[PDB]
Amino acid sequence: GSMYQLQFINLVYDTTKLTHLEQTNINLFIGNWSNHQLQKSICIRHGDDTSHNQYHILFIDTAHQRIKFSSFDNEEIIYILDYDDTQHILMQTSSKQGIGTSRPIVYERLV
Amino acid sequence: GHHHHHHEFDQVQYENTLKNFKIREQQFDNSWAAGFSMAALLNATKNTDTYNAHDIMRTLYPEVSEQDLPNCATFPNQMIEYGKSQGRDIHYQEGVPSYNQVDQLTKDNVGIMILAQSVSQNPNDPHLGHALAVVGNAKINDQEKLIYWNPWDTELSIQDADSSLLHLSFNRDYNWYGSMIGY
């Protein structure tokens, strides 16, 4: 009996500038996802120039089925999302300039 | 899914691990790896249980909100200054320490923290830094190994002494680019 924190992640990218593999790869992460131990949930969407909670894509990693991104308002935090299966993705955080990376955290599909 | 198995066929001919080392806490959703590593190393060499990642990080980031603290990582100079603050003359050494050096440091109850960095595949692909703890060294199947602890884990890991390539959990690879020695 307890509230979760929800982080809205609106990714901004020009669908126009991507290979099809890249597009398939990003699309893996669009959806709503939760971790029950942390009581955290993320709602990932393809946003636009006008969305709030905007995040910039730094790199699309098709080889490992992964994307790296940062929030528009804090470039010192890098998020890494890895695809596991349609019901699970892994999110990790790291810093831009320092040393220390989080454990990959499992988020399972919901909604 | 994954189970633990037996490893009957290994021949551990020699093992030398830091006196009093014990994994006491695990890193999840924060960037405190260096704090986890330093805490475990100092707990081992000081023979205590009072160090912990959160408290180290708080000391390094006294003005950051509790909410923003998880996202603070560690600079090399903080690793050095923090160790000194605890009575440890920390020195950086580039590259992977030799088996013989690890063996000597470990017998002298001196801790070593691994500084690792992922390998970028493009200019837009930022390499990531991570920190781990050396636990000691072993000769296994006639091969020299180093023993280390990734804060992500609850168990120890074994590294070929002649390799800088760390194959971490969740299939993440980092290179050991240097060490902070003296904890």
Q: Hey, are the CB atoms on B125 and A101 less than 8 Å from each other?
A: no
Cβ–Cβ under 8 Å, residues B149 and B136: no
What was the elucidation method?
A: X-ray
DSSP run (H or E) holding B56? helix B53-60
Task: Give the separation between CA A40 and CA A87, rounded to whole angstroms.
Answer: 16
b (16+ CB within 10 A) / e for A42-60? bbbeebeeeeeebbebbbb
Distances (CA, A) of B21 to B46, B72, B103, B125, B136: 10, 25, 15, 36, 10
Q: Hey, are the CB atoms on B71 and A95 less than 8 Å from each other?
A: yes
Q: Where are the alpha helices (DSSP H) in chain A?
A: 20-27
Its domain, for residue B35, covers: 1-183
CATH number at residue B94: 3.90.70.10
Residue B143: which residues within 8 A CB-CB, separation 6 or more? Answer: B160, B161
Query: Is the alpha carbon torsion for A87, A95, A15, B124 positive or negative?
Result: negative
Give domain A1-111's CATH architecture: Beta Barrel (2.40)
Task: Give the separation between CA B20 and CA B46, rounded to whole angstroms.
Answer: 9
Task: Give the separation between CA B43 and CA B53, rounded to whole angstroms.
Answer: 11
Scanning the structure block, which residue is given the tokens 């949930």?
A41
Can you read off the two tokens belonging to residue B73?
């990582």
Chain B hits for A105, CB-CB cut-off 8 Å, are 28-29
Chain B hits for A97, CB-CB cut-off 8 Å, are 73, 75
Phi (first) and psi of residue B125, to 5 degrees: -100, 90
Cβ–Cβ under 8 Å, residues A110 and A34: yes
Breaks (C-N over 2.5 A) in chain B follow: none
Cβ–Cβ under 8 Å, residues A89 and A28: yes
Q: Hey, are the CB atoms on A105 and B28 less than 8 Å from each other?
A: yes
Chain A hits for B35, CB-CB cut-off 8 Å, are 100
Can you read off the two tokens belonging to residue B13?
């001919």
Residue B82's SS3 state is: helix
Q: Which of B140, B136, B148 shows the shortest CA–CA distance to B174?
A: B148
Task: Give the separation between CA A28 and CA B36, rounded to whole angstroms.
Answer: 32
DSSP run (H or E) holding A85? strand A74-85
Instruction: Let me know if A94 is exposed, middle or buried by CB neighbors in 10 A (0-12, 13-18, 19+).
Output: buried
Into how many domains does chain B fold?
1
